[PDB]
Design a protein around this ligand. Structure first.
Ligand SMILES: [Mg+2]
Ligand SMILES: [Mg+2]
Ligand SMILES: [Mg+2]
Length: 414
DNA sequence: GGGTTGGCCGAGCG
């Protein structure tokens, strides 16, 4: 039925957005009550559950057998009324970057209701989000946060004083009172969630419904910092919980800290005292892995050297891991890592930083090709592993021709 | 503030 079930859902989303663009919150709550009680909404709910690797909960259920789809949506045809939330399965996922990050595992019926009210919340949250909120929206990458940082902080387009701040509180530490105050919902179901734990209390508020909440909480900031009526002094650029606010002093940025601490005070949120520091460009703040400075009246969004270190930690871990593997496995595992840290910044000033990265992975590969043969000469390992393909010699890759793809060769789009 | 290439000294024993 999926030839249609995206379409009518999305048309109803469009109508909910048209309702929010005039006043008509009656129309909003009506069409949310309707899209919550559509067949197509429930079918989209069970697809967006089932295609996210469903596993064991306390209220255990299945994905497959292809009637549990149709009978599950036929069950929650009734289930808005006696819809009870059950708790989550507090179970880790054991990551390898240094922790075991928790992920509270909720019931698949609860996840179907999270997908239903998620696609009810979305068109209201598109039109009620800030014009410069770049976190987790539709059609917005982290790179357009840097593009907004460019047109905001270009030639004289600010005046050189920037707070870099960040939010305290681990989980949805928002006061549940305030969540029931103003989020466009049917507040029985929202009340039922927020009593029932609903997200295992090690969240970071950046379980797909929780970012919609964390966006809707943090969208008064732009119109509240429109209180400062200066030319380009205060601009807010925000990725989901990282924002930097411009200025031209350290005291008018103390006005902005007072405003923002009043704004977060209405919730359970605060700017800290430790992280939140005003800093004069050109000295520089690190924004989403990108360092912003001026370097004497340029901008130079460089990828910061706490992004470079995490990248070389990824490659160092791969080549300590494939320490005695095949060469073609080392090609096949290093190649997506380098291509991923390539296309994530193929837009800004990264070319020289790409060459220093390719130097650095070359010496990692030379200790690769030289550790592996313990008593053979260096011309032997060189012509064994590194094979000339163009003008250049020292291309890591043998045979056609399969070889590592250089991060230096990624052709930056201005 | 985008492009392109370099790096490799040999030998014996285990
Ligand atoms: Mg250099
Ligand atoms: Mg021996
Ligand atoms: Mg022996």
């Amino acid at each position: 039925d999926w030839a249609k079930a995206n379409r009518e859902v999305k048309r109803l989303q469009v109508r909910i957005a048209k309702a929010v663009k005039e006043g008509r919150w009656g129309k909003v709550k009506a069409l949310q009550w309707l899209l919550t009680h559509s067949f197509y909404g429930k079918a989209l709910a069970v697809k967006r559950v089932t295609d996210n690797s469903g596993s064991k909960t306390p209220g255990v259920d299945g994905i497959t057998w292809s009637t549990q789809e149709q009978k599950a949506q036929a069950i929650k045809s009734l289930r808005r009324r006696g819809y009870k939330p059950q708790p989550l399965r507090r179970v880790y996922i054991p990551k390898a970057s240094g922790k075991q990050r928790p992920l509270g595992i909720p019931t698949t019926k609860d996840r179907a209701m999270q997908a239903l009210y998620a696609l009810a919340l979305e068109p209201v949250a598109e039109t009620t989000a800030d014009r410069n909120s770049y976190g987790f929206r539709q059609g917005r990458c982290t790179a357009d946060a840097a593009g907004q940082c460019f047109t905001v902080l270009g030639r004289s387009d600010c005046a050189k004083y920037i707070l870099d701040a960040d939010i305290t509180g681990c989980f949805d530490n928002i006061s549940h009172e305030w969540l029931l105050d103003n989020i466009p919902l049917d507040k029985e179901v929202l009340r039922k969630w927020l009593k029932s734990g609903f997200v295992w209390k090690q969240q970071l508020f950046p379980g797909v419904i929780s970012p919609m909440l964390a966006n809707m909480t943090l969208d008064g900031m732009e119109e509240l910092l429109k209180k400062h009526l200066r030319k380009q002094k205060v601009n807010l650029i925000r990725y989901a919980d990282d924002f930097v606010v411009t200025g031209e002093s350290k005291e008018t940025l103390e006005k902005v800290t007072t405003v923002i601490q009043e704004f977060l005070k209405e919730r359970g949120l605060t700017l800290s005292e430790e992280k939140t520091k005003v800093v004069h460009i050109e000295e520089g703040f690190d924004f989403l892995g990108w360092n912003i400075r001026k370097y004497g009246e340029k901008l130079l969004i460089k990828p910061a050297k706490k992004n470079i270190k995490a990248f070389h930690k990824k490659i160092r871990d791969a080549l300590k891991e494939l320490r005695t593997a095949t060469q073609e496995a080392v090609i096949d595992t290093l190649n997506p890592i380098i291509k991923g840290w390539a296309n994530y910044h193929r837009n800004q000033v990264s070319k020289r930083i790409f060459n220093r990265a390719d130097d650095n992975i070359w010496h990692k590969l030379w200790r690769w090709a030289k550790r592996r043969h313990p008593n053979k000469p260096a011309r032997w390992t060189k012509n064994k592993y590194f094979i000339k393909i163009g003008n250049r010699h020292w291309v890591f890759g043998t045979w056609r021709s399969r070889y590592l793809i250089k991060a230096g060769d990624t052709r930056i789009q201005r």
